[PDB]
Amino acid sequence: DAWEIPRESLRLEVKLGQGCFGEVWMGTWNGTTRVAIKTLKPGTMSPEAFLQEAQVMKKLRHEKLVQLYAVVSEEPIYIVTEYMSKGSLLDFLKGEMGKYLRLPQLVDMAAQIASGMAYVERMNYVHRDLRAANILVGENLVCKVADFGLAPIKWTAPEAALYGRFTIKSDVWSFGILLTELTTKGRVPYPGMVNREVLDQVERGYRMPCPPECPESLHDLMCQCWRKDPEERPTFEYLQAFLEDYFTSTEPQYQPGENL
Ligand SMILES: CCOc1ccc2cc(-c3nn(C(C)C)c4ncnc(N)c34)ccc2c1
């Protein structure tokens, strides 16, 4: 398989995160190419199960999906992808950058995520775990969809959470929650609510209100993503176009405020 590379060609420089699976590192590849590297800890998790997420990355290719570069598919396993210099979108929003992000930057970030998910939509795949922690940020506010290991009740559509009906339309619901993460600079949704209280409230028709300084027009889009019936929720194609055109077609009189 042409994705395979020799173990000697990777240098693991700075550790970026730990977990149940293994580790993630910034590194070099072939001595020239900055990369990110994920390792599986051999005795920790199924090796057959781990390579299925890498198989999904061999097929999907798009400027807004984190790109697979190479693999070492024998234990100890290594997975090599493009390096996203600013880490997870969740960390980015909460960190020192968050305070300067305004609505124009955040909507443009939303638009890119929608573009990647529009490609996932065209290919008839389902992500299942769309949220800020699974988006990565590069230079110039480039945002890419990551982590297809599944392909979090607060991000999951009711029909998916309750009955296992995962579809691209349940991803749209999550995207709607992701818009709140973007507009609150990365606060956990449904603040002050535990999981069980979220499920009962949501089924009884509760939806998060307009975030502070978020234009009503963007909150309406959130509400479209949270329609009880999955079929009446918008497509990613639609979401992409709306967000791309936002500051001309929907909010041409937008004024900067304190936070958004
Ligand atoms: C089947 C496994 O496929 C992979 C392989 C590598 C991956 C690297 C990152 C990643 N995390 N981070 C920090 C937030 C810890 C990153 N920082 C910069 N670049 C990255 N690429 C990552 C995320 C998901 C990945 C999935």
* CA 12 to ligand 1 center in whole angstroms: 13
Contact criterion met (CB below 8 Å) for 57 and 151: no
Select 84-253's CATH number: 1.10.510.10, 3.50.50.60, 3.90.550.10, 2.120.10.30: 1.10.510.10
Question: According to CATH, where is 1.10.510.10 located in the chain?
Answer: 84-253
CA 11 vs CA 8, 37, 54: distances in Å: 8, 9, 20
Resolution (A): 2.3
Residue 150 Cβ inside 6 Å of ligand 1? The answer reads no
Whether omega before 76 lies within 30 degrees of 0, making that bond cis, reads yes
**Which residue of 15, 24, 59 sits with most ligand 1 atoms within 8 Å of its CB, as the best mutation to test the pocket?**
24
Angle formed by the axes of helices 103-122 and 168-183, nearest 10°: 170
Contact criterion met (CB below 8 Å) for 244 and 170: no
